[PDB]
Curated annotation (Swiss-Prot), chains A, B:
Function: Freestanding tRNA editing subunit of threonine--tRNA ligase, the catalytic subunit is probably AC Q9YDW0. Deacylates (edits) mischarged L-seryl-tRNA(Thr) in trans; has no activity on correctly charged L-threonyl-tRNA(Thr). Probably does not aminoacylate tRNA(Thr). Deacylates correctly charged glycyl-tRNA(Gly), but not glycyl-tRNA(Gly)(2'-dA76) (the terminal 2'-OH of tRNA adenine 76 has been dehydroxylated) nor the 2'-fluoro tRNA derivative, strongly suggesting the editing function is catalyzed by the 2'-OH of A76 of tRNA(Thr).
Protein name: Threonine--tRNA ligase editing subunit
Misc. remarks from the entry: There are two ThrRS in this archaeon. The first one (APE_0809.1, AC Q9YDW0) is most similar to bacterial ThrRS but it lacks the N-terminal editing domain. The second one (APE_0117.1, this entry) is most similar to archaeal ThrRS but lacks the central catalytic domain; it probably does not aminoacylate tRNA(Thr).
Recorded domain comment: The N-terminal domain (about residues 1-140) is an archaea-specific tRNA-editing domain that has a highly similar structure to Dtd (D-aminoacyl-tRNA deacylase). Editing of incorrectly charged L-seryl-tRNA(Thr) by this domain is tRNA catalyzed.
Self-association state and partner proteins as the record states: Probably interacts with its catalytic subunit.
Cellular localisation: Cytoplasm
Residues of the full protein shown: 1 to 136 of 421
Gene transcribed to yield this protein: thrS2
Length: 136, 136
């Protein structure tokens, strides 16, 4: 699993066209104030142990940053060892579930299987942009 | 070399704190309308052949998108096989130079060696977010 952590002042997205023949989530749009935005690429070896490590790390980082909102943003573009779409969706659902057991704020999982527009204002501090790899 | 291509409606950044003991570029800030924003991670094996392939691809993609501005945005976070900072700066300077021989619009290379804030409004169309790997 490959993650990009962006500490944002604000974040918003809208689904536009479907990117899979049948997207497993309904279309939608949402906008947020200060949040940790976690661009999340699910990779072929990812299982429940991987999900648990990512969830702990996201919780830990969110705590460091004093953020109370996390956005789990499905993202196909951070790796060249992608999990298949079905498996990726399952892991992202597991990741959201796991994160809620570790982090007490708003957890928003954006819809999987869509092209999206988005806007982000990303902070400039030294810990505002980080990437993470998790495996088992 | 690992690149992320974001087709934006608008883009802006500001350098904030230095991220290397001596950043090789001066601090600054800039803002843009519609542009291809190319988050660019220079990797250990990257040489002039790699730079030339990336430059051709960026030019080709920009042409497809009908964009007339490209932003080469140094980014440390797309890979776990980073080139050293000196070498990375050199390759990014080469990449800007190479791109200008292939693409006729505005080419902006953002400063290397800084933490930056930024904002982006990324389009939602199917070719609006892509990643690319180049090697030699
Ligand atoms: N292995 C994977 N890890 C994370 N997300 C994945 C995935 N495989 C497929 N997706 C999702 O399907 C859309 C089309 O690839 C993807 N959409 C996106 O990457 C949008 N942000 C594009 O605008 C994403 O929702
Ligand atoms: N191998 C590499 N490829 C591309 N850029 C690289 C690099 N090694 C160092 N940099 C630059 O140094 C700043 C601190 O890592 C980096 N700064 C950034 O990644 C900012 N956008 C953070 O806000 C970047 O300017
Ligand atoms: Mg809508
Ligand atoms: Mg300034």
């Amino acid at each position: 699993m490959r993650l990009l952590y962006l500490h944002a002042d604000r974040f918003e997205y809208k689904t536009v066209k479907p990117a899979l023949k049948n997207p497993p989530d309904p279309p939608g749009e949402a906008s947020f104030g200060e949040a940790l935005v976690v661009f999340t690429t699910v990779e072929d070896g990812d299982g429940p142990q991987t999900v648990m490590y990512a969830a702990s790390d996201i919780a830990s980082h969110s705590s460091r940053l004093k953020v109370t909102t996390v956005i789990l943003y499905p993202y196909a573009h951070l790796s060249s060892r992608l999990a298949k779409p079905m498996a990726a969706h399952k892991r992202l659902i597991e990741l959201e579930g796991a994160l809620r057991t570790k982090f007490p704020g708003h957890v928003h999982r954006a819809p999987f299987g869509w092209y999206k527009s988005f806007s982000i204002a990303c902070k400039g501090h030294p810990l505002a942009e980080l990437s993470r790899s998790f495996t088992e």
